[PDB]
Design an enzyme around this catalytic site. Sequence first.
Site, PDB file in Angstrom:
ATOM      1  CG  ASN A  40      -1.706   1.289   1.369  1.00 49.45           C
ATOM      2  OD1 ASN A  40      -2.761   1.464   0.749  1.00 49.45           O
ATOM      3  ND2 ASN A  40      -1.220   2.185   2.230  1.00 49.45           N
ATOM      4  CD  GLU A  41      -1.353   5.827   0.119  1.00 48.13           C
ATOM      5  OE1 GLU A  41      -0.672   6.656   0.760  1.00 48.13           O
ATOM      6  OE2 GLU A  41      -2.611   5.808   0.161  1.00 48.13           O
ATOM      7  N   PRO A  42       3.646   2.477  -1.637  1.00 45.82           N
ATOM      8  CG  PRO A  42       4.467   1.184  -3.404  1.00 45.82           C
ATOM      9  CD  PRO A  42       3.186   1.590  -2.723  1.00 45.82           C
ATOM     10  CB  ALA A  60      -1.119  -0.071  -3.862  1.00 46.12           C
ATOM     11  CG  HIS A  65      -4.646   4.632  -2.697  1.00 42.88           C
ATOM     12  ND1 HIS A  65      -4.005   4.437  -1.491  1.00 42.88           N
ATOM     13  CD2 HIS A  65      -4.981   3.401  -3.153  1.00 42.88           C
ATOM     14  CE1 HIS A  65      -3.942   3.142  -1.240  1.00 42.88           C
ATOM     15  NE2 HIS A  65      -4.532   2.493  -2.229  1.00 42.88           N
TER      16      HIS A  65
END
EC number: 3.2.1.37
Lengths: 502, 500
Positions: free
Chosen positions: A160-162, A200, A229
């Site tokens: 998630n959001e790397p 992501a 996102h």
Amino acid sequence: MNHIKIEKGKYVGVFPDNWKFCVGSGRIGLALQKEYIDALSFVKRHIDFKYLRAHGLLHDDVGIYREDIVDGKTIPFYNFTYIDRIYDSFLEIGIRPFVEIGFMPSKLASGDQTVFYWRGNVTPPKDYKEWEKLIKNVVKHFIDRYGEKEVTQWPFEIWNEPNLTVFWKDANQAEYFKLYEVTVKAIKEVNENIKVGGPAICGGSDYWITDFLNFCYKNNVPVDFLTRHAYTGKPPIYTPHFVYQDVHPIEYMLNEFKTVREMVKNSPFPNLPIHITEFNSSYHPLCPIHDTPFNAAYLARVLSEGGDYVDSFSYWTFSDVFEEADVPRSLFHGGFGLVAFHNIPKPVFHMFTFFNAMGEKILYRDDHILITEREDKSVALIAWNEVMTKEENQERKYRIEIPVDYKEVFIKQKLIDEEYGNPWRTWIQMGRPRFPSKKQIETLREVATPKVTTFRKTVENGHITLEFTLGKNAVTLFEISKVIDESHTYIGLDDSKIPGGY
Amino acid sequence: HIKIEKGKYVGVFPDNWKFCVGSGRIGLALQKEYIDALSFVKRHIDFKYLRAHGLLHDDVGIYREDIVDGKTIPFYNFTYIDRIYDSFLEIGIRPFVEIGFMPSKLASGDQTVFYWRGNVTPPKDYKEWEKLIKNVVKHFIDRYGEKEVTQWPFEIWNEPNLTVFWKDANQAEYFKLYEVTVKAIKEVNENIKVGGPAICGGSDYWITDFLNFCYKNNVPVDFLTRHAYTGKPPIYTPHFVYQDVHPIEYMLNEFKTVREMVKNSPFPNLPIHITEFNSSYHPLCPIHDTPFNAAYLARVLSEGGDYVDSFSYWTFSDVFEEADVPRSLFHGGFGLVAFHNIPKPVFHMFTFFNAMGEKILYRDDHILITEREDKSVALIAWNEVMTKEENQERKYRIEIPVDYKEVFIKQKLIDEEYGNPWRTWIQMGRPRFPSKKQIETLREVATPKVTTFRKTVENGHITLEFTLGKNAVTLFEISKVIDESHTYIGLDDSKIPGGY
């Protein structure tokens, strides 16, 4: 103003169901909570979401990864007690997991960096063959418990959001790709019909897409779909109790969808489905805009048009059952959820349910209204009026000419604004109680409904004209349909004969 | 073996056994599994109170701190605990409020306990802890009202005599914590009954120490609390904890000497609350899953009420986390009920005691016979068997006087053969994470064997002959029949195909 004449039997595009493909959630361990499951059922009695997206499948509260110490060697142990209950609960309700692999279990970690109140470790694994061992066992355990035909319908997104350092040690892009590769090959080893994707990313670093998709084409690394996102919140100010934020106009997010769609069109995989695995206006779990009629009207257009560019866009989240910023301190508190505790729907919840009425044939659409024809005859439309500034332009009038083949018309309207279905206001009026009583909770439930109004119109010259005006932050829904009057089958029907002046 | 009596009583069987039950940390009460279980139990056993740790743990998050300019001012967040005590009341049960442990922000030191890291030190500033307790109590009255909250007993801390639960086991310091806490509660509403010191066995000097400390200076005390186990020093294992156990007489006598201590103490009529009790005291000890523990513990339900006002089985369900997350359906957790609302043998043993009236006809080490107000008779017999090299079966012949002509007997049997899902689970492969169809098989068998008989009555008495197997518990209910067959005109079962 805003005049609209719909031409008999003419269509522009089609309304897909992408808008209900998936929702977001508090971390998966919270799915153990009675409140969670009560809220998830309530949502699911009203919106047929197919997928549920949540952080923390491998957090240590769900307790999957643990270590046993035989002699001097340590051995992996894979505890499925909690994850079995959780995913059992989902399938009973009728929602599959959109599986998000993360974050990192404490006893695989390489560092001590953790995000959130519940301190999910975001360092890479200190041993990728240990990591691969854990993914494999999880995946085949799912196949054993649930069956291949079912698990192959679950998508897996890697991390998630790397692109953010608060979500992945040093935002390291070489490392993320290595993590992605190890993980997805583990997955596809167990069953290669399982669909995988990523990366992501948050908004702002859209180059990660191109690097990510290039990395996969180059090195023969599977990717079956893209995720990202999309929030619209401008830099925030904080507070021990609140995070306050302004937001770009809703156009800004839709622009991001179209942008990333064209980004993958110039990929080596020009048909990657895109799943916007998180979207909202403000991105903080304690920002009161989420509670407001504004946020319903502001997000409404996303449902109306987001499906033109992406295959899904999941609203984060379905319920205030949430814990990234500690336990909510007040009934209304800024939480991401469509539903506040006690199954109290916020404006945005009702706005979602409005889109259940849309047929697939779009009659008309612009920036603030969608008009569809249902398969059964009927016409249904949703209009919204989000007003960001106290200045600006506060109201929006519509007259709509609608052709109809029948002589007698029935019209249903549902309306939400600052006046109707806005329990945040009634709550403020109550004194902003932090921990209200059952009787207070119930008056809020009484007012968290749309205002519903019904009309009979006997129609002139083969066409109905609707005239209505939206006040500030309103969303509304009209259903127009043919009446077959049966009053003639009532022999002697005369309302004038009923006391009451009738 | 051989028992007979006539119209006369021997004692009164109180409802003390239903008083309270233990539970996992109240934080866990948010779990659907927990609530699904507490509802299922309470559908079968009218327990009145629930005792649990963790009221001030940070999972439930009551105590937080905000920074305005430079200072730190407290914040008391009731979101979770409201939800939890709300569901308790909705179910029909109240909390035995156990004050603890210490919120991390208020804590003086680093020591913790359990998988879930409850802090066991005193407050850095007792005036702040006074603030915390009073605010929480006031909120409770604001939400639920005086008439309700005053029905809630308050117990202070837990097992302070051990270092794990209270750093250094400082008896002097714990006395301080008890003093500040108790008159805080009382300052909010003095009619709230408070008590202590919730120690375990092997340090009963704490009792009259504590008890005299409260007589000596100020400190009000309305009841005494203590735990009661029988586990011998344990073997450990990354998956198991194994314990042998004293005979049940041990704790049943531990009850009595504690009643004595208060009979001789400054408060000769102090009520006594055994707030924890089981055989072995570890969550990963398979003994709790066995027919043995049901037969081993039956006698506590029979006699313990003659010495103590309450004794709460730790715990009503396997929803537990002190030893991390259970790794297998059966894992030796404390609960009466295992996951999926699958009843352990001990549970059925508890539901047997519903059948008892208050008038005891006869009672000894392995049976209890009672008469119910409708003038019907019922008994529970147990047969715990600690060893392979023992007398295994245990025999009974009972003669009962009955005024009526036709009698009906229903029997409920559990042993190693009947009501024993553990054993069927072993047959299945000891599945750690059982399928659905495995769960439904466990439920099909996790029920007592039920058998009914009809008999004509001769010379105003009946005779009951029955043999308990190893580790068995059974229930007999004896009832008047009013035959209605004469009113079925033309009745004749012989005209039914099937050799009837």
